[PDB]
Amino acid sequence: QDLPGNDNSTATLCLGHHAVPNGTLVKTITDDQIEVTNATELVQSSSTGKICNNPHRILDGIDCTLIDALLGDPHCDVFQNETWDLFVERSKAFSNCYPYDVPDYASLRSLVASSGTLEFITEGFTWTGVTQNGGSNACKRGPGSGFFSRLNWLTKSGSTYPVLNVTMPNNDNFDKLYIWGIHHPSTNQEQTSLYVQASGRVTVSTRRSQQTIIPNIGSRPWVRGLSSRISIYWTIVKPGDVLVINSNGNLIAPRGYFKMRTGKSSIMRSDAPIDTCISECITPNGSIPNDKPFQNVNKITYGACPKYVKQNTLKLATGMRNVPEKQT
């Protein structure tokens, strides 16, 4: 074939792989620190500190909780008919109207918070034989006395409080949320002065349900000059059903209905600053990037967020084992 290759020598070929001077330690099935060429972090552990105002509709509650925005505390009149994807409540919020309590505050806050709208429709209730629009100096609206914008305090007319028995049909094709309440007097004297009967009673019903609440007289702690209280209740009325309000004293009546919807709204307690940026994931600590699969910033989240994990770092190896050639 070929002729005399006078020289017959050899060659050496060595296969091998890279190594890096630096390198990163990662956990394994068999080791918990083994050094690889490179790795990537899968736990997001820092927030920007600011709630980005985009893409969800953030409504800053300023110094209103959602329930005071709902009831219509004078200072919260700014939120009438407002809407949100996320309502942010602030630690600085305060109520500043008639002292009230809400038996299941936690469910009414939830229920409005995910409906996502404070859209109110006033309805033509006719209260015959009682004085409408009562107010208090603890709920100052402007210079004068006032009360919650969405409720109507009824007191006697002259020398009588009749048995009110009114009805409002749900003729539309959506559910109607009605907020109403009852006034708890401090003294039996107060009771008879305002509502004549020495024992009031409120019964609010639909074809499906009924609540009867009787007021409770007694002194509570002075709050804004008052020892009386009003407790708030709610009734959802389905399409085709009918609300019947029947009372004989102490009724704080509804002025109409909030309309309910179904969506992705929720509420979040946070003093983080809202800022202009687009971020999908919101944490009470501020928005965080959802590029990584897990996060350790907060177990409270809203939006497309990484799954909260107790670990603050988890490195995924993206390279071979680092076996360098120098000493250390």
Partner: protein, 175 residues
């Protein structure tokens, strides 16, 4: 790892190789040389990206959930709210921890595999013309100039061309 090439029969990596993950260093009639192997580098890189992309697959989104912070003491219902969340967090934390362990263990065996595959592939190609020195280097028993080393690297080496030269050099000698 499972194949014993990386941090195995190949004693250590080359910090100098900056152009790829796996490769060749050779010394022949024409001098010395180094060169990355881009096919196996791409093979290892593509699998590690594939793996990576599956793990960055969709954060699912959640909107109204349950309260997870409370300021008053309530008892039964609040204990359950807290217990639902704490068992959810430990289960997801266990998942994250096992996922990176399995994943990392596999990435080390996978890259070990590719090393060993390139070695086997070069072995097979040299046929009766080279012997394995056992440290990831082959001793080629025939004159192999730079173009020869380039044909082993780009996979076109014809062993037949050098088989008699090699077999002579390799065996005959004096025993």
């Amino acid at each position: 790892g499972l194949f014993g090439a990386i941090a195995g029969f190949i004693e250590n990596g080359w910090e100098g190789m900056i152009d790829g993950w796996y490769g060749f260093r050779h010394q022949n009639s024409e001098g010395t040389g180094q060169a990355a192997d881009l096919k196996s580098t791409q093979a290892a890189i593509d699998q590690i990206n594939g793996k990576l992309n599956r793990v960055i697959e969709k954060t699912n989104e959640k909107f109204h959930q349950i309260e997870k912070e409370f300021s008053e003491v309530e008892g039964r219902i609040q204990d359950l709210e807290k217990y639902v969340e704490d068992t959810k967090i430990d289960l997801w934390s266990y998942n994250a921890e096992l996922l990176v362990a399995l994943e990392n263990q596999h990435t080390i065996d996978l890259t070990d595999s590719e090393m060993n595959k390139l070695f086997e592939k070069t072995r097979r190609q040299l046929r009766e013309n080279a012997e394995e020195m056992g440290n990831g280097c082959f001793k080629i028993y025939h004159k192999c100039d730079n173009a020869c080393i380039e044909s082993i690297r780009n996979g076109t080496y014809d062993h037949d061309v050098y088989r008699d030269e090699a077999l002579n050099n390799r065996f005959q000698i004096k025993g």
